[PDB]
């Protein structure tokens, strides 16, 4: 066949992907990058020809063909030809070398004359000329221009530096450090004609094809690395750089190779890599005379490491001596003296790693350091469309550096270069709106850096931003978004406060640039409100609908969520995160093109889960399967992360995504209430006449004013709270209770006295307010707080007593206020011990009444208290009595799963497939069901520290529906209640609960 060899070339060459034929004749080869190289002589083939014979000719011709394309091109530029001309007809590898040789020649003479300025503009113009050519160019040649730009920037940078030198000695020093590409206008053996000088040392360009690789930006640091590599190689020693991950040590060795026309073979060591394969590859590298880099050599297993390290010595000892043949893998194999071994050394937990002893007198160790960013910044600004790239790069860096020294040391704050690359990345669309000016940079600083800052640091940013550079007075997209945001919130129930507008604005501007968004804040900050409000405002402003998928991240396993593979049958089933993407990608049957897709993760985020998606967070925007595939994500599809803390996540994960730190709650105590009330009234409209509703909403408004409550909520803090929850999150507990207690007595509000009516209202409100602030209190404290309520409420208004109650007649509508009445119990001998026996107390009735009231509200209940305090019985007996609710008992243990909860429910629940909610999970019988979760603070947490079972209940409490673990669909639970008992978490055995779950609970400490 012949054509079937092209597959295997990718491996044995590294640069090329597939080979080009005219069948009888080989016209050329194409690289993994897409670039097409054509040979000088097309190599003739016959059927009875061997692969080894024909391919060997190709390796030779592929190098010759590069020299041809190089000399052809170099000669052209020498004859005053614009570089824009050359690009279109010559392969990158060739044009790059031609530039380098001419550049070097042109600057070499320019050191003598000192005619730098004349050459500088000249170069600068070629840069601008290349840039504008790129905008209008075909994607393939688009790679080639960009790759060349990296180089031309290097050229001009060095010249500019050279212009600046105090003297000529200063210029000859700087020039010596640089990689100078010389050609011999003397000689034969053309493959050996090009050589490279640096620090006085020379190094022959071998002519291997490199294709068009992603070329690293030239840094002083990069040249120094190149300089150490050349210094080791000159004395026939191995190059080795140790240092922290992400310092680009292998990329350097890749680039150092390219600069010299070499495709480096990189061994990723200990990625479950066989010794047998490496031993083969080492023989091949010593024969073919290639460069091998050991990528993260440190990570090898001791048996392997010994064996490998000893082999490597053979090679490096063979070179230093120059032995023609060296023995390794117990066979006599010949050694090319062009061969080199490179070792990159990532650090361990213990320290920056070391080479094995034998390798210490065979290699030369060097310390890679992160690049001082200024130099990277300037080039990046140059590429976009500079304005003054030098001033911005100095100014941006100074400012970022300044923030770092001037802001508080906060965990998630990164003012490292990653951050400035990001400011710069965000800058490009921004430039489109405004200018390649500082002003566009200024805006991008506050688009990225500001959404992640917290109030103290928020001014430091503003103070030092104006201190370093002042740009402008007025902002675009100022009116238009804002009225679309106000209109969305009025509709949603929300209040546009300073902060809620702010964090809504911060968010709007970020979705634009960022595809992964993070929202971090305390439980009940306003996140769900911010994004649900902004996303809603965009369907008003753009006209694009949204399709939101809110998933609890840590309720499901990595297997339930990304895609789980079974070890033996290798049977691949979808998951949750991947399956909702296949609607958009695989079969966009309906309207997805014009829609916006948002997949929200409401639960705490951890390394293991984000690592399994890191590819979407990368510049890739594709999903990588454990087995089988990569699925690409559209620009519509945005992933949000709402969470309470970050401690677990990596700085690398933050800096890929857009981070939105909610310093404080978006909204005022009052404003919360306001929304809460109206949210409660809407529920009632479905089960209450408008005449009734209109009158009852009027009552609420005139009974409780904010001025009184402000002190009440303030005094709430001056109090000892078991199972602590903050004041702001306790609010929903008041209003939901209060409105239900008043809708309770609705009928007796028709005919009752208007002064007396207010007394019924005020009493209920004083009651509902008590359990919502002091319900989880000692009750020794409750009694104390009761007086505090009475104090701050109107003096004349019906005062609260410990056992204060409102009573109406058995057989006739009536109205009077009497408290503490008890039915009297007589039980037989056999009855004495029974799992369901209550001897009612003044306090059993007190708790059983309030406990029942909260369920009428349908707010979840946490009964916290000591063992044998009766929290289980009070809950059980109030409900074992009534026809309405039916109890279901689950005991939690240190390690209980979310399936146990489901299985216990399946016994008392019946799924119905009604088209109204799709799947629903009401109770197996008509009337309401109550899950009693006993020992709720018992199940343990992921090593990160996140109890999924609790988050699952939180899913049921907040979302009201959950995702099916195997079948992968949304089922909305109907009419089911969550109640829990727990012990004080000061007790041993006990686990601290997430505020994000306890916020939806009324807590009664008994």
């Amino acid at each position: 066949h012949h054509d079937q060899v092209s597959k295997f070339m990718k491996k044995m060459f590294g640069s090329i992907e597939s080979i080009i034929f005219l069948e009888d004749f080989i016209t050329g080869v194409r690289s993994v990058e897409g670039e097409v190289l054509n040979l000088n002589e097309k190599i003739e083939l016959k059927d009875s020809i061997q692969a080894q014979e024909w391919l060997n000719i190709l390796d030779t011709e592929i190098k010759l063909s590069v020299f041809t394309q190089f000399r052809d091109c170099l000669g052209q530029i020498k004859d005053g030809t614009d570089i824009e001309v050359v690009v279109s007809k010559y392969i990158f590898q060739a044009i790059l070398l031609s530039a380098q040789v001419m550049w070097t020649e042109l600057v070499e003479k320019c050191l003598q004359t000192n005619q730098f300025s004349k050459y500088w503009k000249e170069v600068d113009m070629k840069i601008k000329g290349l840039l504008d050519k790129l905008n209008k160019s075909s994607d393939n040649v688009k790679k080639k221009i960009e790759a060349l730009l990296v180089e031309y920037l290097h050229f001009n940078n060095v010249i500019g530096q050279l212009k600046n030198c105090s003297t000529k000695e200063e210029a000859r020093l700087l020039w010596a450090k640089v990689q100078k590409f010389y050609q011999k206008n003397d000689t034969l053996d053309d493959l050996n004609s090009v050589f490279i000088s640096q620090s006085g040392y020379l190094l022959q360009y071998k002519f291997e094809y490199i294709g068009i690789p992603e070329r690293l930006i030239y840094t002083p640091l990069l040249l120094i690395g190149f300089a150490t590599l050349t210094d080791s190689l000159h004395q026939k020693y191995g190059g080795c750089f140790f240092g922290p991950a992400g310092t680009g040590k292998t990329e350097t060795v890749k680039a150092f190779g390219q600069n010299l026309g070499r495709v480096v073979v990189v061994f990723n060591c200990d990625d479950s890599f066989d010794y047998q394969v490496l031993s083969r590859l080492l023989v091949g590298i010593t024969q073919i005379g290639a460069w091998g880099c050991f990528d993260e050599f440190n990570r090898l297993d001791e048996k392997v490491l010994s064996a490998v390290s000893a082999n490597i010595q053979q090679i490096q000892n063979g070179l230093q001596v120059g032995k023609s043949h060296i023995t390794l893998l117990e066979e006599e194999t010949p050694l090319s003296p062009h061969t080199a071994v490179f070792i990159t050394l990532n650090p361990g937990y213990n320290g920056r790693s070391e080479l094995p002893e034998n390798l210490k007198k065979s290699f030369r160790e060097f310390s890679m350091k992160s690049p001082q960013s200024g130099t990277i910044a300037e080039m990046i600004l140059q590429i976009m469309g500079f304005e003054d790239s030098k001033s911005l790069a100095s100014k941006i860096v100074h400012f970022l550096e300044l923030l770092s020294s001037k802001c508080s040391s906060m965990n998630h704050y990164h003012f490292g270069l990653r951050t400035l690359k990001g400011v710069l990345r965000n800058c490009s669309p921004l430039i489109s709106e405004f200018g390649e000016g500082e002003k566009t940079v200024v805006e991008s600083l506050k688009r990225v850096i500001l959404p992640s800052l917290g109030d103290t640091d928020e001014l430091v940013f503003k103070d030092e931003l104006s201190k370093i550079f002042d740009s402008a007075g007025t902002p675009l997209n100022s009116k238009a978004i804002v009225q679309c945001l106000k209109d969305a919130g009025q509709r949603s129930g929300f209040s546009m406060s300073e902060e809620f507008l702010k964090k809504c604005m911060q968010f709007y501007y970020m979705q634009k640039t960022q595809q992964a968004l993070i929202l971090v804040g305390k439980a009940g900050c306003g996140k769900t409100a911010t994004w649900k409000t902004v996303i809603d405002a965009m369907a008003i402003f753009d006209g694009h609908a949204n399709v939101v998928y809110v998933i609890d991240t840590k309720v499901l396993t990595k297997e339930s969520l990304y895609g789980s593979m079974l070890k033996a049958t290798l049977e691949w089933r979808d998951g949750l995160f991947t399956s909702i993407l296949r609607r958009v990608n695989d079969d966009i049957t309906g309207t997805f093109k014009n829609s916006r897709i948002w997949v929200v993760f409401d639960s705490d985020l951890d390394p293991e889960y984000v690592e399994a998606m890191n590819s979407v967070l990368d510049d890739n925007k594709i999903l990588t399967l454990p087995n089988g595939e990569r699925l690409p994500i559209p620009p519509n599809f945005r992933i949000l992360f709402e969470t309470d803390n970050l401690d677990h996540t990596t700085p690398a994960t933050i800096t890929r995504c857009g981070l939105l730190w909610f310093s404080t709650d978006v909204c005022s105590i009052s404003s919360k209430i306001d929304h809460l009330l109206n949210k409660s009234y809407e529920a009632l409209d479905n089960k209450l006449s408008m005449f009734e509703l209109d009158k009852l909403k009027d009552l609420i408004s005139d009974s409780f004013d904010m001025a009184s409550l402000t002190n009440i909520f303030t005094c709430s803090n001056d109090l000892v709270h078991i199972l602590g929850v903050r004041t702001f999150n306790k609010l929903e507990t008041a209003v939901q209770l209060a409105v239900h207690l008043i809708s309770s007595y609705r009928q007796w509000f028709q005919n009752l006295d208007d002064k007396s009516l207010k007394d019924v209202i005020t009493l209920l409100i004083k009651r509902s307010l008590l359990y919502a602030l002091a319900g989880d209190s000692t009750g020794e404290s409750q009694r104390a707080f009761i007086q505090t309520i009475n104090t701050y409420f109107g003096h004349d208004s019906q005062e609260l007593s410990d056992y204060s109650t409102i009573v109406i007649a058995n057989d006739k509508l009536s109205f009077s206020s009497f408290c503490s009445e008890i039915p009297s119990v007589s039980l037989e001998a056999h009855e004495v011990m029974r799992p369901d026996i209550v001897i009612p107390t003044i306090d059993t009735i007190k708790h059983e009444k309030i406990f029942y009231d909260l369920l009428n509200s349908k707010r979840g209940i946490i009964l916290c208290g000591p063992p044998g305090s009766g929290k289980t019985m009070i809950m059980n007996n109030a409900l074992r009595n009534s026809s309405l609710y039916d109890v279901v008992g689950i005991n939690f243990s240190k390690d209980t799963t979310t399936e146990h909860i489901l299985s216990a429910l399946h016994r008392h629940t019946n799924y119905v497939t009604t088209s109204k909610g799709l799947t629903l999970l009401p109770k197996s019988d008509i009337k309401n069901l109550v899950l009693f979760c006993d020992e709720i603070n018992l199940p343990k947490l992921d090593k990160y520290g996140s109890q999924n079972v609790v988050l699952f209940l939180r899913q049921l409490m907040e979302k009201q529906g959950f995702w099916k673990t195997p079948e992968n669909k949304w089922v909305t639970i109907e009419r089911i209640h969550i109640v829990g008992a727990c012990n004080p978490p000061t007790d041993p055995g006990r686990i601290p609960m997430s505020e994000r779950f306890t916020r939806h609970a009324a807590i009664l400490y008994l």
Partner: protein, 447 residues
């Protein structure tokens, strides 16, 4: 042995030592024990642990033997050397005089002296590796040392002065280990001395071939007078304990002065022949001083360099290679000097340096050692003038050797020669005092 792997002792080693103690009577034999233990086991420890075992063993004897007033006086002194406490001990006319002489060392802020006080008080001959080897009655020895030095060259003069028969064997590649195992079996029959340079690197082989080989060779006692030596590095791969316990142990703690190392660097340089300019030999002389000055700084840390850095004869070689190359590619005009410093200070030697603090120190050394017109003055006493017009290459070798022979290294060398302050040296002396004093108190209370 709990702190360090090489510091092992068997019960039999203590017994054999106590037998040598023979071949108020109870009081004299007791004093004979302490001395003989200091004599045999001081050798297998480094200078820090020598001083630790000195101060400890001194208190192990004198707390039982002398007064209770003695006990708290010396202990309140060891507390001052450490950072435990500061006090003036209980003072009595003529009551104690040796103890009164000690506090004089501690109060004079002189630390190294007060630490060695306890060594002199043993009244023992501190055995020279030769004496130890001569006494020792085994054909095997492992001498570990810090990477700064190697006792390879001490062994050459040790063999020359008695019994000759020196055979240096590098363990390098398959060839060296393979040639090595051949030279081992033949030398024991012959009776020649053998050396196994830097085993730690070739160690995987040790556990298979040497571990079995040395264990099996109880006929090595039967074989001709022969002695095998192995060189280790203390900071480095941990030798098998069973092989280690079987073989005798020494720590080469002998550190050369600045001037001595300059003379030792320059010494070999004539063996290379002649391939370069007369001028070059001046630059090779410059590097000789430079290398001997950074190596001298390497030990002094933290005051001095931030971490322990190791510099090699490879670092000199890579530096001299660059020097030959710069003089080969440039004219003989002196001014090439600018990029000579940069390349020596940042690639050749600054390569291993990772901390920015220390990278500036290597540069500031190059500032002084390399750039220098007419007169350099490497050290306070010694001036190096640039090559004369006569341009004799044989004269200049002899001139530059003569400049070494003229000078004698001062008392204050580490502060005068390495341009770092005197107050830093004292700070360092104080800290190594604190380390010895601490570890001794810790040891006493533990038993």
């Amino acid at each position: 042995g709990q702190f360090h792997w090489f510091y092992g002792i068997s019960i039999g080693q203590f017994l054999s030592c106590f037998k040598r103690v023979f071949i108020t009577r109870v009081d004299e034999i007791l004093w004979l024990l302490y001395q003989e233990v200091y004599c045999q086991f001081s050798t297998a420890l480094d200078k820090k642990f020598k001083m630790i075992m000195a101060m400890t063993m001194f208190c192990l004897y004198k707390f039982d033997i002398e007064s209770e007033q003695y006990k708290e006086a010396v202990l309140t002194m060891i507390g001052v050397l450490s950072e435990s406490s500061d006090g003036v001990p209980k003072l009595t006319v003529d009551t104690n005089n040796d103890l009164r002489y000690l506090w004089d060392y501690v109060t004079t802020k002189s630390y190294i002296s007060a630490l060695n006080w306890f060594k002199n008080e043993f009244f023992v001959d501190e055995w020279n590796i030769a004496d130890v080897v001569a006494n020792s009655d085994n054909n095997y020895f492992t001498m570990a040392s810090e990477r700064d030095v190697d006792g390879t060259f001490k062994l050459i003069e040790l063999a020359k002065a008695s019994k000759e028969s020196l055979k240096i064997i590098p363990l390098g590649s398959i060839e060296n280990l393979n040639y090595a195992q051949e030279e081992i079996s033949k030398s024991k029959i012959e009776g020649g001395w053998i050396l196994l340079q830097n085993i730690q690197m070739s160690l995987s082989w040790v556990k298979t071939y040497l571990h079995k080989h040395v264990e099996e060779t109880k006929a090595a006692e039967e074989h001709e007078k022969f002695k095998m030596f192995m060189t280790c590095h203390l900071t480095g791969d941990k030798l098998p304990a069973p092989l280690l316990q079987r073989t005798d142990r020494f720590v080469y703690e002998d550190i050369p002065g600045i001037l001595d190392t300059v003379k030792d660097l320059w010494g070999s340089q004539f063996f290379t022949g002649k391939i370069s300019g007369v001028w070059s030999v001046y630059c090779t002389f410059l590097l000789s001083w430079f290398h001997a000055l950074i190596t001298a700084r390497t030990r002094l840390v933290p005051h001095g360099f931030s971490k322990k850095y190791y510099f090699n004869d490879c670092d000199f070689q890579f530096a001299s290679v660059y020097l030959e190359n710069v003089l080969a590619t440039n004219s003989t005009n002196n001014i090439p000097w600018a990029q000579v410093r940069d390349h020596i200070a940042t690639i050749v030697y600054g390569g291993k340096i990772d901390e920015e603090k220390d990278l500036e120190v290597v540069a500031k050394l190059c500032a002084h050692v390399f750039c220098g017109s007419d007169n350099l003055q490497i050290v306070p006493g010694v001036r190096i003038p640039q090559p004369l017009l006569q341009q004799s290459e044989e004269e200049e070798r002899a001139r530059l050797t003569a400049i070494l022979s003229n000078t004698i290294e001062p008392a204050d060398s580490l502060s005068s020669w390495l341009q770092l302050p005197r107050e830093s040296i004292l700070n360092y002396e104080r800290l190594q005092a604190k380390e010895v004093a601490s570890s001794t108190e810790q040891l006493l209370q533990e038993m």
